[PDB]
Amino acid sequence: NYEELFQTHKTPFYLYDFDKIKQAFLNYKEAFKGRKSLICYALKANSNLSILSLLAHLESGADCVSIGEIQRALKAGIKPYRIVFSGVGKSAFEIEQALKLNILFLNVESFMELKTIETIAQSLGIKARISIRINPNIDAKTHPYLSTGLKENKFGVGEKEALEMFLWAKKSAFLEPVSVHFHIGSQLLDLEPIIEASQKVAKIAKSLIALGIDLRFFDVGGGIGVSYENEETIKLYDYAQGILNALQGLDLTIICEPGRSIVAESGELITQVLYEKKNKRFVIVDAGMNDFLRPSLYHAKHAIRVITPSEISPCDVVGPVCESSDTFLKDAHLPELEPGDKIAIEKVGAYGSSMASQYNSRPKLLELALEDKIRVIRKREALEDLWRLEEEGL
Amino acid sequence: NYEELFQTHKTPFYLYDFDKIKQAFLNYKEAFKGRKSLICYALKANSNLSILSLLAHLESGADCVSIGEIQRALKAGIKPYRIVFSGVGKSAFEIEQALKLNILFLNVESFMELKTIETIAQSLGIKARISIRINPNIDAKTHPYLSTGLKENKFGVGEKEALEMFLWAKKSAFLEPVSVHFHIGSQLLDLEPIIEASQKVAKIAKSLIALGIDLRFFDVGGGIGVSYENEETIKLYDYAQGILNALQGLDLTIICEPGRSIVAESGELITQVLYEKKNKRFVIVDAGMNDFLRPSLYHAKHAIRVITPSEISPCDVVGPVCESSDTFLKDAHLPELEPGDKIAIEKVGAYGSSMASQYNSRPKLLELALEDKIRVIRKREALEDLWRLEEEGL
Ligand SMILES: Cc1ncc(COP(=O)(O)O)c(C[NH2+]CCCC[C@H](N)C(=O)O)c1O
Numbered sequence: 001n002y003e004e005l006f007q008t009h010k011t012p013f014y015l016y017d018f019d020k021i022k023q024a025f026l027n028y029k030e031a032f033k034g035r036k037s038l039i040c041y042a043l044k045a046n047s048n049l050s051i052l053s054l055l056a057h058l059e060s061g062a063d064c065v066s067i068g069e070i071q072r073a074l075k076a077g078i079k080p081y082r083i084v085f086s087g088v089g090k091s092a093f094e095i096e097q098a099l100k101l102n103i104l105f106l107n108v109e110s111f112m113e114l115k116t117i118e119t120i121a122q123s124l125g126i127k128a129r130i131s132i133r134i135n136p137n138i139d140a141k142t143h144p145y146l147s148t149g150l151k152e153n154k155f156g157v158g159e160k161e162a163l164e165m166f167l168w169a170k171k172s173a174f175l176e177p178v179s180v181h182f183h184i185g186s187q188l189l190d191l192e193p194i195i196e197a198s199q200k201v202a203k204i205a206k207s208l209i210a211l212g213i214d215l216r217f218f219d220v221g222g223g224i225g226v227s228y229e230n231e232e233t234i235k236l237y238d239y240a241q242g243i244l245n246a247l248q249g250l251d252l253t254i255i256c257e258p259g260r261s262i263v264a265e266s267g268e269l270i271t272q273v274l275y276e277k278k279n280k281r282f283v284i285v286d287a288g289m290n291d292f293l294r295p296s297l298y299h300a301k302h303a304i305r306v307i308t309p310s311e312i313s314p315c316d317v318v319g320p321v322c323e324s325s326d327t328f329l330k331d332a333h334l335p336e337l338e339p340g341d342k343i344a345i346e347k348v349g350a351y352g353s354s355m356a357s358q359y360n361s362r363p364k365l366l367e368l369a370l371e372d373k374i375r376v377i378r379k380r381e382a383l384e385d386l387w388r389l390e391e392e393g394l
Numbered sequence: 395n396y397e398e399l400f401q402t403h404k405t406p407f408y409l410y411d412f413d414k415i416k417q418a419f420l421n422y423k424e425a426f427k428g429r430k431s432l433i434c435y436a437l438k439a440n441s442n443l444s445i446l447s448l449l450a451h452l453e454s455g456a457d458c459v460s461i462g463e464i465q466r467a468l469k470a471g472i473k474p475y476r477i478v479f480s481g482v483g484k485s486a487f488e489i490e491q492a493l494k495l496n497i498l499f500l501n502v503e504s505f506m507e508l509k510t511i512e513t514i515a516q517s518l519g520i521k522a523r524i525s526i527r528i529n530p531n532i533d534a535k536t537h538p539y540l541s542t543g544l545k546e547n548k549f550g551v552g553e554k555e556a557l558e559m560f561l562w563a564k565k566s567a568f569l570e571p572v573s574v575h576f577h578i579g580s581q582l583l584d585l586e587p588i589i590e591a592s593q594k595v596a597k598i599a600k601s602l603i604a605l606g607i608d609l610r611f612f613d614v615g616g617g618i619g620v621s622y623e624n625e626e627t628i629k630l631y632d633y634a635q636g637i638l639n640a641l642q643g644l645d646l647t648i649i650c651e652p653g654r655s656i657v658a659e660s661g662e663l664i665t666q667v668l669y670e671k672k673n674k675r676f677v678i679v680d681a682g683m684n685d686f687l688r689p690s691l692y693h694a695k696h697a698i699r700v701i702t703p704s705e706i707s708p709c710d711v712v713g714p715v716c717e718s719s720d721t722f723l724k725d726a727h728l729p730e731l732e733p734g735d736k737i738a739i740e741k742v743g744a745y746g747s748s749m750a751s752q753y754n755s756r757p758k759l760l761e762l763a764l765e766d767k768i769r770v771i772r773k774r775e776a777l778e779d780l781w782r783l784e785e786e787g788l
């Protein structure tokens with residue numbers, strides 16, 4: 001169906017196959033059938049208003065890390081009682097705004113945050129439902145930037161301090177602790193660290209209840225990685241089974257905060273070839289690191305597939321930006337290409353456009369959705385949009 | 395003067411001391427007094443319309459890498475005959491648009507680009523002034539992402555292919571080769587690799603002229619680094635002296651494309667403290683990697699200075715974003731701080747806001763200028779600006 005597409009839309013652009021988002025979400029809803037669970041899509045992976053509306057129709061929840069995300073979610077149709085707010089740096093304005101929006105709960109990451117929420121809750125005359133994120137100091141075995149479960153990391157808190165915080169929330173007349181939460185990392189290929197984390201948190205949860213803390217939710221976060229380089233992926237059945245066994249004796253609603261595993265595969269970066277250059281061969285395309293930062297930021301490798309039917313040789317697929325970090329794949333192996341040919345960077349649905357910038361003064365890309373039925377979900381940015389907010393200062 | 399500032403403006407924001415931009419530019423204009431030179435500020439470092447207008451008043455030139463940058467420069471008042479367009483991925487639209495704007499020249503990076511420019515030039519009935527970027531395969535001794543002078547990199551071309559391209563431009567009736575160009579890297583602390591590059595390119599330039607190619611410009615690019623961690627910096631006097639000696643016998647106008655060394659120091663990231671968290675101590679501030687990507691992308695370290703007068707201990711200064719890469723300084727050493735205190739991240743004038751994104755749905759920061767006289771040079775983004783272009787798809 002590519003022909004009609006390239007005739008009506010200029011490259012480069014993000015193209016999303018919506019069914020895969022629906023199917024991926026649905027696989028999470030059924031993984032936990034014999035139990036009460038809540039799947040909160042992590043907006044950070046991709047907050048496009050349209051994909052959120054799709055998830056909202058499937059009654060998805062939302063794991064937000066900012067007021068901006070909470071608003072996107074509400075605007076897309078996600079129910080406030082299915083929204084959870086995490087974040088080690090929530091500002092008083094975000095805290096206050098969250099409380100007035102009646103979301104499920106604020107997942108606190110510091111004792112000082114807990115007190116800040118109490119002070120605001122009290123002034124608003126409401127009892128804030130809150131969850132406490134614990135750092136189980138477990139190595140998720142992943143990229144350091146994507147690793148968040150070690151004492152080293154700024155996320156959550158130790159068992160000792162957690163117990164102290166829960167008790168404090170219990171005593172407060174403006175705090176209602178109702179959930180325990182953890183998230184050891186992202187793009188995880190090993191299910192063991194996850195299970196080990198669930199066991200440790202389940203142990204403290206059992207202890208928390210024995211102390212009167214009335215828990216109702218057990219949040220495991222997200223973290224399941226995708227097959228970027230054809231690696232084996234943690235199966236949901238094995239994931240859900242491991243968690244249910246870790247929760248023996250605890251009658252709690254399980255919450256999952258998957259992001260990448262919901263949208264990664266459904267999104268592809270369609271970019272056109274501009275030139276071919278040569279002892280090494282460089283294939284210059286019109287998309288750049290400003291559009292897709294994963295490769296440079298995490299040395300990630302996404303598959304590149306030629307869409308235009310067409311001698312194979314090694315070559316670095318590079319974008320137009322002035323930096324050496326602006327190269328999608330080193331020594332990729334592709335046939336000889338010519339100006340205008342089209343290629344697709346695979347599995348860019350997560351942390352693709354959500355981390356894109358306008359570096360080198362390049363407008364944010366057009367985003368298209370496929371629904372059996374091509375339509376635009378984000379209009380391309382005009383050149384003037386780049387400096388719109390700088391004109392009055394000129 | 396901070397008091398009035400914090401009373402009228404909310405953190406976090408970028409604050410620019412304009413004099414330092416003026417002074418830094420002026421130091422480049424005089425480094426080459428006994429010669430004809432042209433200083434083309436590299437927009438990529440910071441394209442804010444206002445700082446460009448300042449430079450335009452000092453009759454600065456502009457080194458652009460996209461049509462968006464060329465337009466910013468023109469709009470700020472920079473003369474078209476002082477604008478040079480580099481880029482390994484210029485699209486036909488940018489090429490054509492550049493030609494119609496009568497800029498100084500297109501600095502080509504591939505033989506295929508050269509032919510693309512010719513085809514367009516011919517259709518427009520004009521003779522395109524062009525420069526050819528050569529890759530001298532010299533190690534600038536810097537961070538790999540910031541290193542661009544090796545055969546390994548996608549920038550420029552070898553001597554053999556360069557000679558072939560220049561001759562091709564000479565024969566063409568729509569191409570006028572008038573300049574040689576090179577840029578081995580960014581944030582360079584060692585002046586030797588620069589000098590070695592100038593010598594090699596000066597040798598080929600001498601050879602090019604002997605073959606009838608009428609050169610008028612000798613472009614050395616930018617690259618001079620700043621003192622982020624109190625290191626010694628390449629002095630302009632030593633830089634200009636080394637270049638003049640390398641150019642013995644060549645009567646050519648020298649062009650410099652400095653970026654970082656023009657605006658780095660003049661810009662600071664003013665951010666407020668939100669919480670303090672504890673065996674390690676984390677200082678959570680309201681600015682994040684989405685606002686300043688250097689630390690995560692290049693493991694860069696910028697100095698952090700407390701602005702609020704106030705026991706010193708080790709601590710990681712972190713932002714609010716959900717990733718472990720969102721930490722400004724590991725084991726920094728600062729006094730005990732409390733919610734509301736103000737700190738400034740130093741030398742963020744270059745590649746600061748120019749690489750900023752809206753990750754975690756965070757609006758682009760407010761940018762203020764100091765001119766003896768605080769005024770806004772970029773209004774903060776509203777929350778609705780985040781999803782403005784996504785509403786019609788909803
Ligand atoms: C608390 C919390 N919940 C869910 C997630 C999302 O997990 P995932 O998408 O299922 O892995 C997170 C993860 N936060 C950081 C993810 C960084 C990804 C990075 N930009 C990349 O790979 O491009 C979380 O904090």
Ligand SMILES: Cc1ncc(COP(=O)(O)O)c(C[NH2+]CCCC[C@H](N)C(=O)O)c1O
Nearest residue numbers: 322436577580581616617651652653654745
């Ligand atoms: C051809 C060309 N001219 C000038 C520069 C600018 O040089 P500088 O600012 O004086 O070093 C460049 C450099 N291009 C890449 C710079 C990447 C910087 C990176 N984002 C960072 O340090 O944050 C050039 O290509």
